[PDB]
Design a protein around this ligand. Structure first.
Ligand SMILES: Cc1cc2nc3c(=O)[nH]c(=O)nc-3n(C[C@H](O)[C@H](O)[C@H](O)COP(=O)(O)O)c2cc1C
Ligand code: SF4
Ligand code: SF4
Ligand code: SF4
Ligand code: FES
Ligand code: FES
Ligand SMILES: [K+]
Lengths: 263, 45, 432, 214
């Protein structure tokens, strides 16, 4: 009825009007690269890692923000698409610090993983790097903000999910910095979820700091009992010890967040 | 009335001060039409 | 009688008859010069007639991109939904080398205030916000005085110009940001947020300022609309080449004898413009190194191209550049072209909003590279690296500021590559 | 010095006193009414600029005042203050001198203007004179490119400068007079220095060229 037909790599898919080019690719099984897009946050379109070619169109479109149109053929593996990804990944890593050994995100980092899969294998950056000062937003979330990639997921989450307008960007240009501006704490019953949505090690768990690595944890899918909601969780263990608690997506209960008492 | 094209007639702005712009906006308010309303006092309302 | 040589505009056909501030900018004189004349009769013919007049004139946007104004204004001309409609007048005026809008606002303020009313009536808007940069304080106050004079005379407000159409003109001032000249980033600044451009879609004629249908138009594009409706759509198209019609304001600056603002016909040869109105290049036409034909964003062109280049949208596109704002920047052979363009990259680095990755990181990167080329502290291989770094910024950003930082670099590499490499040898020899 | 995080000081803390004067509260009322009902956040920029014209700079307490009256979250007012360069977040001198050194002003020797001012006032770019009268900084294009080189002191442009025209401007400001803005050469605005090449005839009057039925 109201469905429109679009093609993903020449393959027909029927989508509701208003579907984004990124969501059309989901239905054929293709996951577009992303950093700023989150399905449970508002669309931003600032990282530019989802840029994709549309056949017979000269300029690439941001897949996360662009609605599809009837008859569009999305080329996700095209030469124009792949070169867009290498360029953007090249910019994202230009000022990123060489911290992977000392960074808790190492081994479960979307910057590391998407660099391996869609980025170049080497650097041609021959300049100095940006160093940003760190900000104390409380006892539960550690900030190494030199690692931030300015996706504003923390900002959009804190505004829209947690109903707290304390995070924002200050300055502009290469010196635009995420934070609170003043010395303030982002203490909320849901504050600890910015750790998960931060795709990099800019925001990490202080209690969990330095203890383990992602590859060595055993995952046990269990239930939270700190309240009567019944949040689905993952218990990470290593050598018979509980290391941390993570949310497990359950749409009809906790979605993909947990409270800080659970975490 | 003479077409004297030899003087700069934009000399008024040399007397403006700190609140010239916002004072004019205050006088202009009596003329504006009623503003439209979205319906709520703010998006947070 | 298709005209073949364009230029030599006569003062009868000029629009900004008070461009130089030698008459009375207040309402009394402006009415003596033909402003606010039969504005009622214009507004009673309706939104269709006015738009057709603009479409016929071949008027294209005077703010940089250069889009056909009549077609652009026609998107607003649609049935309402319940939301107000607005006209945003882009008086940010921040493109380096560009200062045409400054003169309109302070010396022909009533040409703008009428264009807001005529343009607003064409699109069906209820009011016009005029965004003006916060540095232009004296110009903003002159504009406020003119808007008061028009209000007291019944020309704008309830039953404007004795027509039954209600219209307000608001003047809002910025706070320092070249990026607020970008049409969506302007809208965001009027809403009280950081001037960060929006992605499109949705287009402003769907969801604009306050979430309402909106057209953003340049000061010069709006300030000539009442005249095109008066003297006619066909009269305007009789100037300039086909598809590049009208008379244009020109800023000549740099290494000319007499830097000046002037109005001249479109398609005027660039050599004629510099010699005739600006007094020619400092030291004669043989001292000319390169010319930036329309503000910082446009690529430079070398002296060989300047000989026979016509100043219109299509001619300058052939030369791998653009008319842009028509801000002509002149550099003579004493100029350091590398240092000249490196300072533009330092400007774009300072004006990027920081929102999106290719410009937040890419423009700052190109700035660091262009700084070393100035001292020669590089290798010839980095030049093709800098070329590819720019091509990754271009077309991959949210707004066109990212484009505007790549094009200056590409122009320097395109026409002065030997100059870049030559400096690298000297640095190597000294440090050997 | 271009820091975008606030650290409380005895002179700039949340309890530092700031309140709009009763006259400036009326001006805000007209500012706010320019925008649709339900979109008061549109007034953040003008109200902050008003807070800066009353105080001369924006202390953190002034920002919280703007957030309160407009009912905007304080962070969203901190973002605007840092984003726009006209807002001063440290004390600036009575006369804030801004020299455009972008390319079109650089090609007409704006460095001579910058060197002339630095030597006269005995400061370097970004500093404030010991007695607090002057603050020198560079800036980007100020939309006065044909009249380059040019500087803005407070809200006034002084254009077509020469390294002695500016040193006269500064002498007057020290004395207490405020010199008249505009070009300091023999032209009044942007016209060609050689007495006009256009618009020399008398302007035509109403009804010239009007089409058939207009
Ligand atoms: C960085 C940047 C700065 C801009 N500055 C201006 C400006 O100062 N004035 C202007 O009219 N358009 C400016 N533009 C272009 C506007 O986005 C838009 O194209 C224009 O206002 C539309 O009006 P027009 O159709 O009359 O050209 C700028 C664009 C960019 C990317
Ligand atoms: S955020 Fe990712 S890429 Fe950056 S240092 Fe940490 S693990 Fe490495
Ligand atoms: S702190 Fe993390 S989530 Fe927030 S903008 Fe930076 S990278 Fe994105
Ligand atoms: S291209 Fe530059 S100015 Fe435009 S949105 Fe991206 S970062 Fe901001
Ligand atoms: S995921 Fe689309 S631009 Fe960030
Ligand atoms: S370059 Fe200095 S005013 Fe434009
Ligand atoms: K994280």
């Amino acid at each position: 009825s109201n469905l429109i037909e679009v093609f993903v790599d020449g393959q027909s898919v029927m989508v509701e009007p208003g579907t984004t080019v990124l969501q059309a690719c989901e239905k054929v099984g293709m996951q577009i690269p992303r950093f700023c897009y989150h399905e449970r946050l508002s669309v931003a379109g600032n990282c530019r890692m989802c840029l994709v070619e549309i056949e017979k169109a000269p300029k690439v479109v941001a897949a996360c923000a662009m609605p599809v149109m009837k008859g569009w053929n999305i080329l996700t593996n095209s030469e124009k698409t792949k070169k867009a990804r290498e360029g953007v990944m090249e910019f994202l890593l230009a000022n990123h610090p060489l911290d992977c050994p000392i960074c808790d995100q190492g081994g479960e980092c979307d910057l590391q993983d998407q660099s391996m899969m869609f980025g170049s294998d080497r650097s041609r950056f021959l300049e100095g790097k940006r160093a940003v000062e760190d900000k104390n937003i409380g006892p539960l979330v550690k900030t190494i903000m030199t690692r931030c990639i300015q996706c504003t997921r923390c900002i959009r989450f804190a505004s829209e999910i947690a109903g707290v307008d304390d995070l924002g960007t200050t300055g502009r240009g290469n010196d635009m910095q995420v934070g609170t501006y003043i010395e303030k704490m982002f203490m909320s019953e849901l504050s600890g979820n910015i750790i998960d949505i931060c795709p990099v090690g800019a925001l990490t768990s202080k209690p969990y700091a330095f203890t383990a690595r992602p590859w060595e944890t055993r995952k046990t899918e269990s239930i939270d009992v700190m309240d009567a909601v019944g949040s689905n969780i993952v218990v990470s263990t290593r050598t018979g010890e509980v290391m941390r608690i993570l949310p497990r997506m359950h749409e009809d209960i906790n979605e993909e967040w947990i409270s800080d008492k659970t975490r | 009335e003479p077409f004297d094209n030899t003087t700069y007639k934009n000399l008024q702005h040399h007397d403006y001060s700190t609140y010239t712009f916002l004072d004019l906006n205050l006088d202009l308010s009596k003329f504006r039409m009623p503003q439209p309303s979205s319906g709520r006092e703010s998006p947070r309302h | 009688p298709k005209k073949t040589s364009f230029g030599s505009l006569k003062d009868e056909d000029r629009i900004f008859t008070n461009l130089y501030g030698r008459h009375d900018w207040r309402l009394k004189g402006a009415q003596s010069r033909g402003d606010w004349y039969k504005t009622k009769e214009i507004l009673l013919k309706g939104p269709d007639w006015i738009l057709g007049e603009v479409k016929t004139s071949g008027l294209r946007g005077r703010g940089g991109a250069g889009f056909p104004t009549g077609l652009k204004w026609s998107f607003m001309n649609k049935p309402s939904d319940g939301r107000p409609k607005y006209l945003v007048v882009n008086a940010d005026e921040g493109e380096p080398g560009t200062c045409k809008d400054r003169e309109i606002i302070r010396h022909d303020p009533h040409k703008l205030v009428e264009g807001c009313l005529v343009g607003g009536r064409a699109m069906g808007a209820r009011a016009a916000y005029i965004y003006i940069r916060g540095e232009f304080y004296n110009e903003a106050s002159n504009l406020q005085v003119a808007i008061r004079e028009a209000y007291e005379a019944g020309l704008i407000g309830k039953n404007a110009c004795g027509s039954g159409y209600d219209f307000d003109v608001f003047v809002v001032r910025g706070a320092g940001a070249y990026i607020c000249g970008e049409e969506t980033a302007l809208i965001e600044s009027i809403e009280g947020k950081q001037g960060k451009p929006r992605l499109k879609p949705p287009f402003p004629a769907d969801v604009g300022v306050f979430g309402c249908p909106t057209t953003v138009a340049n000061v010069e594009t709006v300030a000539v609309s009442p005249t095109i409706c008066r003297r006619g759509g066909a009269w305007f198209a009789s100037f300039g080449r086909e598809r590049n019609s009208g008379t244009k304001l020109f800023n000549i600056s740099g290494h000319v004898n007499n830097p000046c603002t002037v109005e001249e016909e479109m398609s005027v040869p660039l050599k004629e413009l510099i010699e005739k109105h600006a007094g020619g290049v400092t030291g004669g036409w043989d001292n000319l190194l390169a010319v930036i034909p329309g503000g910082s964003s446009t690529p430079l062109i070398p002296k060989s191209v300047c000989e026979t280049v016509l100043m219109d949208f299509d001619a300058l596109i052939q030369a791998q550049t653009g008319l842009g704002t028509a801000a002509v920047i002149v550099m003579d052979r004493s100029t350091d072209i590398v240092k000249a363009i490196a300072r533009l990259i330092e400007f774009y680095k300072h004006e990027s909003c920081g929102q999106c990755t290719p410009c937040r990181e890419g423009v700052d990167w190109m700035n660091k590279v262009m700084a070393r080329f100035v001292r020669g502290d590089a290798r010839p291989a980095e030049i093709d690296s800098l070329w590819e770094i720019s091509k990754q910024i271009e077309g991959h950003t949210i707004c066109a500021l990212g484009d505007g930082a790549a094009w200056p670099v590409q122009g320097l590499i395109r026409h002065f590559r030997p100059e870049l490499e030559e400096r690298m040898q000297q640095f190597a020899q000294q440090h050997q | 010095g271009a820091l975008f995080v606030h650290r409380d000081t005895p002179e700039n803390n949340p309890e530092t006193p700031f309140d709009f004067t009763p006259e400036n509260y009326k001006r805000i009322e007209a500012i706010v009414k320019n925008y649709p009902e339900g979109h008061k956040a549109a007034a953040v920029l003008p109200v902050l600029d008003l807070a800066q014209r009353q105080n001369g700079w924006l202390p953190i307490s002034a920002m919280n005042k703007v957030a309160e009256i407009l009912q905007v979250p304080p962070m969203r007012v901190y973002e605007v203050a840092t984003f726009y360069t006209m807002y001063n977040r440290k004390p600036v001198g009575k006369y804030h001198i801004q020299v455009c050194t972008t390319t079109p002003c650089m090609l007409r020797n704006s460095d001579s203007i910058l060197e002339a001012i630095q030597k006269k006032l005995g400061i370097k770019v970004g500093e404030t004179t010991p007695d607090k009268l002057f603050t020198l900084i560079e800036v980007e294009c100020l939309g006065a490119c044909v009249n380059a080189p040019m500087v803005q002191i407070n809200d006034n442009y002084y254009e077509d400068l020469t390294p002695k025209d500016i040193e006269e401007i500064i002498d007057e400001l020290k004395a207490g007079k405020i010199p008249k803005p505009g070009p300091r050469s023999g032209r009044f605005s942007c016209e060609p220095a050689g007495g006009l090449t256009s618009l020399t005839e008398p302007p035509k009057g109403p009804g010239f060229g009007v089409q058939a039925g207009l």
